[PDB]
From a paper:
Thus, in the room-temperature neutron structure of AAT, after the crystal was soaked with α-methylaspartic acid, one site reacts and closes (chain A), whereas the second one remains unreacted and open (chain B). In the open monomer, the Schiff base (SB) is in the internal aldimine form and PLP is covalently linked to a conserved lysine residue (K258). The closed monomer displays the SB in the external aldimine form, with PLP covalently linked to the Cα of α-methylaspartate. The out-of-plane geometry for the SB observed in our neutron structure was also identified in other aminotransferase enzymes, with torsion angles ranging from 43 to 96°13. Overall, the experimental evidence demonstrates that O3′ and the SB are deprotonated and likely carry partial negative charges, stabilized by PLP resonance and H bonds with Y225 and N194. More importantly, the SB C=N double bond is 46° above the plane of the pyridinium ring, which indicates the lack of a hydrogen bond to O3′. A strong nuclear scattering length density peak for a deuterium appears near the NSB in the external aldimine (chain A), indicating that the SB is protonated. Remarkably, the peak is not between O3′ and NSB, but is instead located between NSB and the C-terminal carboxylate oxygen of α-methylaspartate. We found a deuteron positioned equidistant between the NSB nitrogen and oxygen of the substrate C terminus oxygen in the external aldimine, indicative of a low-barrier hydrogen bond (LBHB). The neutron structure shows that K258 is neutral (ND2), corroborating its role as the general base catalyst. Moreover, in the internal aldimine, H143 and H189 are neutral, while in the external aldimine H143 remains neutral but H189 becomes protonated and positively charged.
Here we report the neutron crystal structure of a PLP-dependent enzyme, aspartate aminotransferase (AAT), a fold-type I PLP-dependent enzyme that reversibly converts l-aspartate and α-ketoglutarate to oxaloacetate and l-glutamate via a ping−pong bi−bi mechanism. Pyridoxal 5′-phosphate (PLP), the biologically active cofactor derived from pyridoxine, is one of the most ubiquitous cofactors found in nature, catalyzing ~140 different types of biochemical transformations. Recombinant porcine cytosolic AAT fortuitously packs as a biological and crystallographic homodimer, with the two active sites having different activities toward the substrate analog α-methylaspartic acid. In AAT, the protonated pyridine nitrogen of the PLP (N1-PLP) enhances charge delocalization through resonance, permitting the subsequent transamination reaction.
Author numbering: 1 to 412
Write the structure that this text describes.
């Protein structure tokens, strides 16, 4: 009897956020509510394909001049240019000086992967897998997984969330920067921090930038929610743009999954800013090799939609309107969920619910409370106490606020 070559493969733990989408879908209880994955939902609790996207899909579908031939390894040129322009702004001195590069990627995740793979080979030496990599405490789980997979052995965290203050621990963060070895890589959330929903103010960003510049720390921005932090694309990109004006060289992993609602078309872009043009050229050539052995070349549908919307003043205007619409609904739900919790006179303060920005809220519930909420009330969320505000609708608001109350009460 010959045994199987897969006999010893262990059962892996499940990617939780996707594990719950499954549990939710198949859960038969009617009063179930998915406050899990960070995807927008209308007030009717439905996915929303943006009107502008619908528009363009139709145009693309009626364009017979378009073929399916392979795209360049680095991706659709028009897309890479518009994506980078969106984050840096058209008046960017970096764009003017041609020291900006863009690599089309598979969502923000793919962009993060490509940048980590490049750094692990050409940054701070050759194949230097030892440069420390810093992620916020807490942060999006996949930050660790992505950098670990790229080979970095030393992943550290910088203090960010202050539990006994329910906000940003600036001194902690600043202290961690001061103490970070020179050349260390810092993974920064450009805006709408995940999972806290707490971002530094421009004044704090200035302090953060000041230490980074002094200690030659590398800013690797994750920008997955441009436009959600406030509803304004220009505003949500200010930090990245400030670093650029300060002369930093940096990476910016861009995702169009949430702001274009193109979740399943995997549209991402890795923007690179260098001190001089010649370097962008050499960098992209190394990036081509990395891409070639990962996905060979990127898919066209998503990039085509984003490219057409961003290069047509009319589609662009319209898109900015749809974005603001989503952001506005998140602001509306924050005020409501807070009201109800106060009316129910729920133990403790809950101002933070309206203080945090973006799609998420770091509620503050112990895990035992989350288990109660998921098992008893069928209100799916993460163990950490993070909730997707978009999951709230004028309907289920009371059920949730009730459940959160009962929890806090007969659970604490
Ligand atoms: C901070 C951050 N960066 C990158 C990504 C990846 O975006 P992509 O889909 O373009 O690769 C996410 C997505 N976070 C989600 C919305 C989903 C997930 O975990 O993948 C979340 O629920 O946190 C994110 O929250």
């Amino acid at each position: 009897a010959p045994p199987s070559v897969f006999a010893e493969v262990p059962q892996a733990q499940p990617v939780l956020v996707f594990k719950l989408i499954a549990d939710f879908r198949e859960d038969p209880d009617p009063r179930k509510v998915n406050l899990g994955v960070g995807a927008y939902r209308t007030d009717d609790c439905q996915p929303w394909v943006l009107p502008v996207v619908r528009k363009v899909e139709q145009r693309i579908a009626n364009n017979s001049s378009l073929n399916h031939e392979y795209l360049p390894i680095l991706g659709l040129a028009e897309f890479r240019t518009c994506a980078s322009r969106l984050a840096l702004g058209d008046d960017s001195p970096a764009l003017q000086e041609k020291r900006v590069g863009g690599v089309q990627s598979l969502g923000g995740t793919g962009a993060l992967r490509i940048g980590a793979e490049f750094l692990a080979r050409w940054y701070n030496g050759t194949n230097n897998k030892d440069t420390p990599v810093y992620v916020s405490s807490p942060t999006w789980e996949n930050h660790n997984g992505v950098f670990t997979t790229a080979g970095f052995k030393d992943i550290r965290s910088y203090r960010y969330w202050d539990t006994e203050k329910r906000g940003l621990d600036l001194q902690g963060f600043l202290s961690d920067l001061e103490n970070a070895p020179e050349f260390s890589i810092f993974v920064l959330h450009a805006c709408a921090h995940n999972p806290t929903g707490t971002d530094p103010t421009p004044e704090q960003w200035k302090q953060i930038a000041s230490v980074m510049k002094r200690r030659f720390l590398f800013p690797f921005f994750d920008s997955a929610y441009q436009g959600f932090a406030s509803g304004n694309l220009e505003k949500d990109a200010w930090a990245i743009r400030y670093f650029v004006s300060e002369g930093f060289e940096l990476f910016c992993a861009q995702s169009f999954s949430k702001n274009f609602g193109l979740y399943n078309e995997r549209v991402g872009n890795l923007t690179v800013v260098a001190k001089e043009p010649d370097s962008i050229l050499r960098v992209l050539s190394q990036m081509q090799k990395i891409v070639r052995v990962t996905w060979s070349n990127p898919p066209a549908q998503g990039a085509r939609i984003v490219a057409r919307t961003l290069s047509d003043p009319e589609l662009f205007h319209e898109w900015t309107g749809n974005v603001k619409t989503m952001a506005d609904r998140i602001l509306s739900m924050r005020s409501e969920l807070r009201a109800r919790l106060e009316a129910l006179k729920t133990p403790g303060t809950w101002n933070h619910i309206t203080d945090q920005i973006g799609m998420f809220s770091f509620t503050g519930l112990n895990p035992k409370q989350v288990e109660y909420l998921i098992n008893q009330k069928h209100i799916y969320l993460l163990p950490s106490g993070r909730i997707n505000m978009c999951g709230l609708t004028t309907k289920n608001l009371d059920y949730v606020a009730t459940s959160i109350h009962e929890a806090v009460t007969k659970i604490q």
